[PDB]
Every structure is written in structure tokens, then in C-alpha cells.
Amino acid sequence: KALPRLKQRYREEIREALQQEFNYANVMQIPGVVKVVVNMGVGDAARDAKLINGAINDLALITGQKPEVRRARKSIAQFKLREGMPIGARVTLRGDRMWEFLDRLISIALPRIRDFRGLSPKQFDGTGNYTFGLNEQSMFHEIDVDSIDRPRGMDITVVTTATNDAEGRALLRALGFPFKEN
RNA sequence: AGUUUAACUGGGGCGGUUGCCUCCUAAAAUGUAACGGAGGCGCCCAAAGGUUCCCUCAACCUGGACGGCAAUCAGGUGUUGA
């Protein structure tokens, strides 16, 4: 007994508009976002093993779920990197929590970037999966932006059952990502 | 004063070596020598053992903030080259 904003919108308008654009036979062919992905590469694992915990805490406060700590399966010593050194955190988002996260991101933070002209239409890949990146976490009001001791940027990537970049960009437009309309 | 002070060895000496594991020589069973050719061991292990369950890598292509030939991520090819 509840509905998020973007999901109600998705089931109302966007499916209709893509149908009226691309004319699929079955509606099962309709594109739909599955999951959302978050990652943070600490990179100074061999110099600060504590920024890892810092990033864990930030993403906790940001996404409302305890992250995963991705280990280094290979040992490349030109970076000090050794088998099992924690280099980064990672979180998966699916469902109502995902739609809420996109609502927050599109409505609070991305309208808080400094001189946001536009996210490119060219972060796609093969079929329409949008892989962008943030330099700082100085933007989410979710975050306690008084306590941060360093910039700890991140990298986001958005995956969809779309089959090509045209359908991907069209769907993400209907959903309200500020592309550079070109 | 009584006695020891090695062997192999293309004579002896000098050098090197002596035991165990793996490969070729070794001649499609086994086995087979040379001071013939290449290596290694005289350990480690609250788990790197037992059991039940689950999953598949490396590599390449692309996207991608610092990040580059490569770091973590996502998406494909990938019968198996890790």
C-alpha cells in the first residue's frame, strides 16, 4: 500500500511514450531499469586502511544499506596492491529503494552540482547503460557534510533492459536525467 | 706408542658428485646406463584439514572522476588459454 514517485510515473506515462515511439509487438520488450550500482575506489588502501571505513560510513548514510567491501583478487605490486587488500566499497540497489534513490539524486544533489551544464549522452555502452562519476560527496544532504575529513568520490552506473543507446537515452529522458539535449 | 685418513672417475690428481621427488634420453606395457640434458626438496598448514551448500575464471571490446598498460565497477564475447 504505497508507491514511489518515479515508479508510479514509470507505470503511467513513460511506458506509454516509449510504446508510441518504438512500436513494440509485445510490451515485454518495453525497456525497464533493473538496478542501480554504486562504487568507491579508495585506492590508498596501502596508505590509509581507515578511509575504507570512512567510505563505508558515508555510503551507509547515503543509501541506507551496509556496503560490500570488494577485495583485490590479483596482487599488482606497482601500486602496493596485494591479494585481499580492500580497495573499494560497492552497493547494489533494487526496487522501491532504488526509485527513491533516483528521486533524491535527481531532485536534491544533481541540482546542487557546481555549474552543472549537463551529463553527457555518451556515458552509455553497447545498449544504454549510463556510467557516470562524482568527484566529491559534498552534495548529499543525507551526508553530514561537517565531519568529512577528505574528498571520497564515487562512480555510479545505471543498467537497463534497453537494447540500444537510442532507447536508453529516450527512457532516461522520460525519467528525467538532465542529459545535454543535443 | 698404537692407528684412521673413503669411493666414483674415459689412468690418477684438481674440480664436481653420493639420498629422495618430477620430465626427456627410454626405443607406443613395466624396466633400463653414462662425470647425458633441465629443475627441485631436507618444508608448511585454527585451516591451506573433514563435511554440507553455493558460484565460476584468465583474456579481450566498450563505458567509464582522480586512474595511466593495468587497481574496484557495469555490460557483452568467452569450454576453459587463469
UniProtKB/Swiss-Prot annotation:
Q: Which InterPro entries match?
A: Ribosomal_uL5 (IPR002132), Ribosomal_uL5_bac-type (IPR020930), Ribosomal_uL5_C (IPR031309), Ribosomal_uL5_dom_sf (IPR022803), Ribosomal_uL5_N (IPR031310)
Q: Which Pfam families match?
A: Ribosomal_L5 (PF00281), Ribosomal_L5_C (PF00673)
Molecular-function annotations in GO = rRNA binding; structural constituent of ribosome; tRNA binding
Keyword check for rRNA-binding:
yes
One GO CC annotation, please? ribosome
Coiled coil location: none
Biological process (GO), any one:
translation
| Keywords carried by this UniProt record | Ribonucleoprotein, Ribosomal protein, RNA-binding, rRNA-binding, tRNA-binding
Top-level taxon of the source organism: Bacteria
Functionally, this protein is described as follows: This is one of the proteins that bind and probably mediate the attachment of the 5S RNA into the large ribosomal subunit, where it forms part of the central protuberance. In the 70S ribosome it contacts protein S13 of the 30S subunit (bridge B1b), connecting the 2 subunits; this bridge is implicated in subunit movement. Contacts the P site tRNA; the 5S rRNA and some of its associated proteins might help stabilize positioning of ribosome-bound tRNAs.
Q: How does it associate, per the subunit comment?
A: Part of the 50S ribosomal subunit; part of the 5S rRNA/L5/L18/L25 subcomplex. Contacts the 5S rRNA and the P site tRNA. Forms a bridge to the 30S subunit in the 70S ribosome.
**Which family does the record claim for this protein?**
Belongs to the universal ribosomal protein uL5 family.
* Entry protein name: Large ribosomal subunit protein uL5
Q: Which organism is it from?
A: Mycolicibacterium smegmatis (strain ATCC 700084 / mc(2)155)
